[PDB]
Design an enzyme around this catalytic site. Structure first.
Site, PDB file in Angstrom:
ATOM      1  N   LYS A  99     -12.130 -27.558 -67.302  1.00  0.00           N
ATOM      2  CA  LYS A  99     -12.679 -26.246 -66.977  1.00  0.00           C
ATOM      3  C   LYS A  99     -13.625 -25.724 -68.069  1.00  0.00           C
ATOM      4  O   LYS A  99     -13.499 -26.070 -69.245  1.00  0.00           O
ATOM      5  CB  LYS A  99     -11.536 -25.251 -66.754  1.00  0.00           C
ATOM      6  CG  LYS A  99     -10.677 -25.642 -65.570  1.00  0.00           C
ATOM      7  CD  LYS A  99      -9.521 -24.690 -65.292  1.00  0.00           C
ATOM      8  CE  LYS A  99      -8.801 -25.127 -64.003  1.00  0.00           C
ATOM      9  NZ  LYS A  99      -7.532 -24.390 -63.722  1.00  0.00           N
ATOM     10  N   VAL A 106     -11.894 -16.264 -66.436  1.00  0.00           N
ATOM     11  CA  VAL A 106     -11.437 -15.583 -65.245  1.00  0.00           C
ATOM     12  C   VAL A 106      -9.981 -15.899 -64.892  1.00  0.00           C
ATOM     13  O   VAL A 106      -9.192 -15.006 -64.589  1.00  0.00           O
ATOM     14  CB  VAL A 106     -12.335 -15.916 -64.047  1.00  0.00           C
ATOM     15  CG1 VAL A 106     -11.762 -15.300 -62.777  1.00  0.00           C
ATOM     16  CG2 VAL A 106     -13.720 -15.375 -64.297  1.00  0.00           C
ATOM     17  N   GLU A 107      -9.626 -17.175 -64.946  1.00  0.00           N
ATOM     18  CA  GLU A 107      -8.277 -17.590 -64.607  1.00  0.00           C
ATOM     19  C   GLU A 107      -7.231 -17.054 -65.557  1.00  0.00           C
ATOM     20  O   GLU A 107      -6.050 -17.087 -65.242  1.00  0.00           O
ATOM     21  CB  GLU A 107      -8.207 -19.109 -64.514  1.00  0.00           C
ATOM     22  CG  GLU A 107      -8.601 -19.593 -63.131  1.00  0.00           C
ATOM     23  CD  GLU A 107      -8.987 -21.062 -63.093  1.00  0.00           C
ATOM     24  OE1 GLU A 107      -8.454 -21.855 -63.906  1.00  0.00           O
ATOM     25  OE2 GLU A 107      -9.821 -21.427 -62.235  1.00  0.00           O
ATOM     26  N   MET A 108      -7.658 -16.546 -66.712  1.00  0.00           N
ATOM     27  CA  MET A 108      -6.704 -15.985 -67.662  1.00  0.00           C
ATOM     28  C   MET A 108      -6.003 -14.781 -67.047  1.00  0.00           C
ATOM     29  O   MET A 108      -4.895 -14.447 -67.453  1.00  0.00           O
ATOM     30  CB  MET A 108      -7.392 -15.562 -68.981  1.00  0.00           C
ATOM     31  CG  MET A 108      -7.453 -16.695 -70.024  1.00  0.00           C
ATOM     32  SD  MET A 108      -8.386 -16.437 -71.593  1.00  0.00           S
ATOM     33  CE  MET A 108      -7.054 -16.293 -72.801  1.00  0.00           C
TER      34      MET A 108
END
Ligand code: HEC
Ligand code: HEC
Ligand SMILES: [Ca+2]
Length: 309
Positions: A99, A106-108
């Site tokens: 990634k 964002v996925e955090m």
């Protein structure tokens, strides 16, 4: 000037205009969308965290915390690096590990599906995606979102630092004291790991900061197995605290713990100060930022989720 040609063999100046990175064309529709995206806190499930929260354009492109907020609102494991000039870094993470930073960011605090659902719930975002990615039937996708943000990051560069003027020819751009720090930087080994356009950001090395003021040191890792990115030193004056853990606040202490006989980079006190003087000449022009106007939520917009349920 031999010092100058040496510096030009080791480093490059930041380009005067935003670059096309990996074929990512800088059209106005895409850059504007990317800017909105960058400041859009609704990309986080709590609707409070945006890229700007951790890469604050008013604070040097980072958050000035030892480490960023991680899950919940607890301490994260890493210092957030500046987004300024980041598009030039081949090595993008602190630790050697598919990634990218945008996706990881964002996925955090959210999921791709939720982010896409959020963006499609607002008519203005659909129009911007359509204008930024012409001729695609489903333009609002997580990948396009990343492409737009990346296009905006390409404009977040800081050209014209004194040092870049020097590299371009102005022998006077650096003072006496700064030329010493520069000579030291190229003579004591620093360039072995910190060079190129950002004086770093290109490779991992088996060295990391550990608890040993003088409470820390950079030491070789066991069997050279674990590696840390040699940080891009450009704008270092504005990206404190330092190292992967943000454990060191003083730029002077930071240079001290990297300049030891036990690294092939020995420096006495005055030599440290000279390097610090040289490092300060790496601060470029902060890009101007006009705060975007984000569209309002609609009935279909996923509702915010409390951080501490
Ligand atoms: C804090 C909760 C963050 C949010 C929100 C975003 N980013 Fe971030 N970013 C954060 C950290 C702690 C790190 C370092 C991670 C590590 O383990 O190495 C990063 C890193 C980046 C980078 C890389 C810097 C480089 O030198 O190449 C970039 C370019 C980046 N982050 C961008 C980015 C964007 C655009 C975000 C919004 C979509 C975003 N981040 C959110 C912490 C946080
Ligand atoms: C490779 C063997 C390196 C050499 C030679 C030098 N540095 Fe370095 N530096 C390296 C790494 C892998 C790291 C990250 C360590 C971590 O645990 O986070 C660094 C970091 C720095 C920093 C802090 C940067 C930041 O936080 O953004 C500074 C100020 C720095 N390095 C300076 C520096 C100087 C002045 C050097 C020559 C005396 C030098 N480094 C050599 C790897 C390597
Ligand atoms: Ca930092």
């Amino acid at each position: 000037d031999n010092l100058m040609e040496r510096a030009n063999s080791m480093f490059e100046p930041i380009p005067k205009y935003p670059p096309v990175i990996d074929g990512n064309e800088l059209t106005q529709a895409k850059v504007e969308l990317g800017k909105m995206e960058f400041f859009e806190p609704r990309l986080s499930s709590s609707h409070l965290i945006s890229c700007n929260t951790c890469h604050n354009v008013g604070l040097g492109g980072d958050d000035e915390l030892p480490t960023s907020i991680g899950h919940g609102w607890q301490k994260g494991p890493r210092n957030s690096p500046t987004v300024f000039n980041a598009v030039f870094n081949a090595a993008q993470f602190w630790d050697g590990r598919a990634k990218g930073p945008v996706q990881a960011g964002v996925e955090m605090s959210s999921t791709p599906d939720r982010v896409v659902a959020t963006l499609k719930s607002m008519p203005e975002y659909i129009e911007r995606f359509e204008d930024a990615f012409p001729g695609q039937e489903n333009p609002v996708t997580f990948d396009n979102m990343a492409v737009a943000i990346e296009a905006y990051e390409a404009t977040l560069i800081t050209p014209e630092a004194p040092f870049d003027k020097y590299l371009r020819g102005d022998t006077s751009a650096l003072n006496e004291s700064e030329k010493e720090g520069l000579a030291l930087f190229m003579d004591r080994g620093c360039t072995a790991c910190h060079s190129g356009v950002n004086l770093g950001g290109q490779n991992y090395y088996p060295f990391g900061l550990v608890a040993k003021k003088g409470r820390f040191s950079v030491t070789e890792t066991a069997s050279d197995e674990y590696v840390f990115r040699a940080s891009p030193l450009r704008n270092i004056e504005l990206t404190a605290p330092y190292f992967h853990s943000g454990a060191v606040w003083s730029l002077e202490e930071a240079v001290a713990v990297m300049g030891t006989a036990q690294l092939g980079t020995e420096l006495n006190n005055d030599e440290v100060k000279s390097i610090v003087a040289f490092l300060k000449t790496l601060t470029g022009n902060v890009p101007e930022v006009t705060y975007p106007v984000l569209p309002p939520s609609t009935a279909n917009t996923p509702k915010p989720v409390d951080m501490i349920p």
